[PDB]
Design a protein around this ligand. Structure first.
Ligand SMILES: O=Cc1cn([C@H]2C[C@H](O)[C@@H](COP(=O)(O)OP(=O)(O)OP(=O)(O)O)O2)c(=O)[nH]c1=O
Ligand SMILES: [Ca+2]
Ligand SMILES: [Ca+2]
Ligand SMILES: [Cl-]
Ligand SMILES: [Cl-]
Ligand SMILES: [Cl-]
Ligand code: NA
Ligand code: NA
Length: 326
DNA sequence: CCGACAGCGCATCAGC
DNA sequence: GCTGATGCGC
DNA sequence: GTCGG
């Protein structure tokens, strides 16, 4: 946190551009600059020094000079004073309320937590659950709790079918001492890139986790991706644990390594790696790495037998999960 | 200068 | 109903 | 907002 003031400023600008301005490329530019500054191992002394880093340009350099000189950014001080911007920024903190829905709610005079709770009939299912657990979803998950959650998920999955493999990914697999939510990568030998020999593979696992009262709510659910809510059991006379967000992704078993690369992240790491893949003439998603032909059309999937294989194709030295927290 | 910016699953909706 | 665009999320 | 070409 050598440069935490600068990176907090850039993150707040990013959130403004995403939630209020609906300018997704500015959001991504601010996030990229915040990420490269966060890993820079010196306390930045000037905007010129920061501008040497890729993704920091003239405008961010000038903002860094203002921030270093004064401890503030007038642009953000005004954004914080703007009622409409402040209202939109708040509403988007509810899961399921994005920039478009937030602005529509503000138009209708729905702009506070209190307004949402009085207008549950105007929320879709996702938004209603996001509101229900607004406070809980703000809280981080200690690694100790992530380990108990891992134990429950891996054991309940084994009870459905011992051939399932469940892997906890995200920041947990990167070794973080706390996580924002739990991400589970699921495989089963019946589901490959060549065939689906059993139906309901994801459903059966979700059902089992609901049966044991671990999964408590569903935000969305399809054949391969579950997004929902879970909760650790508590002991006698103990306060309940907060409800937690959980994502489950069922990935073809022969595409495990591309899948675990994607789901381990971080998100900025994936964007850096995929962008670099393009410059090398490849495209990476969660299933495959493919060559790009002379016309830009993705070719056939390349053989992958490890995470490192994906790094090797794009001429990157392998980076352990703990070194991907960009 | 200016095109491009990572890539995709599920929910919701308009148009038919 | 389906298809394609959009919103929101990972 | 930034960058490669
Ligand atoms: O959500 C955003 C995106 C996520 N991902 C991948 C990579 C990421 O690691 C994993 C899970 O997403 P999370 O939001 O749970 O992020 P975590 O790294 O686990 O951090 P937390 O500790 O939970 O905050 O999905 C992307 O590839 N792109 C995204 O845009
Ligand atoms: Ca996570
Ligand atoms: Ca997640
Ligand atoms: Cl933009
Ligand atoms: Cl500020
Ligand atoms: Cl593919
Ligand atoms: Na730069
Ligand atoms: Na939101």
């Amino acid at each position: 946190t050598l440069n935490g003031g600068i990176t907090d400023m850039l993150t707040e600008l990013a959130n403004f551009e995403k939630n209020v301005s609906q300018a997704i490329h500015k959001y991504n530019a601010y996030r990229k600059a915040a990420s490269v500054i966060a890993k820079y191992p010196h306390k930045i002394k000037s905007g010129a020094e920061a501008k040497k880093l890729p993704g920091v340009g003239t405008k961010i350099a000038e903002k860094i000079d203002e921030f270093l000189a004064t401890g503030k950014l007038r642009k953000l001080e005004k954004i914080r004073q703007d009622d409409t911007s402040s209202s939109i920024n708040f509403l988007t903190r509810v899961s399921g309320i994005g920039p478009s829905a937030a602005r529509k709610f503000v138009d209708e005079g729905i702009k506070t937590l209190e307004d949402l709770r009085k207008n549950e009939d105007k929320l879709n299912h996702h938004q209603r659950i996001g509101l229900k657990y607004f406070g809980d979803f703000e809280k981080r998950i200690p690694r100790e709790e992530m380990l108990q959650m891992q134990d429950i998920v891996l054991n309940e999955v084994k009870k459905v079918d011992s051939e399932y493999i469940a892997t906890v990914c995200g920041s947990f697999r990167r070794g973080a001492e706390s996580s924002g939510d739990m991400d589970v990568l699921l495989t089963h030998p019946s589901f490959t890139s060549e065939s689906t020999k059993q139906p309901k593979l994801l459903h059966q696992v979700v059902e089992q986790l609901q049966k044991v009262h671990f999964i408590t709510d569903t935000l969305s659910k399809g054949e391969t991706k579950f997004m929902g809510v879970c909760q650790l059991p508590s002991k006698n006379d103990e306060k309940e644990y907060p409800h937690r967000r959980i994502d489950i992704r069922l990935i073809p078993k022969d595409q495990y390594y591309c899948g675990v690369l994607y789901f381990t992240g971080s998100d900025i790491f994936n964007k850096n790696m995929r962008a670099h893949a393009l410059e090398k003439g490849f495209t990476i998603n969660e299933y495959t790495i493919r060559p790009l032909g002379v016309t830009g059309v993705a070719g056939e999937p390349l053989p992958v037998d490890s995470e490192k294989d994906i790094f090797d194709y794009i001429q990157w030295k392998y980076r352990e999960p703990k070194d991907r927290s960009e």
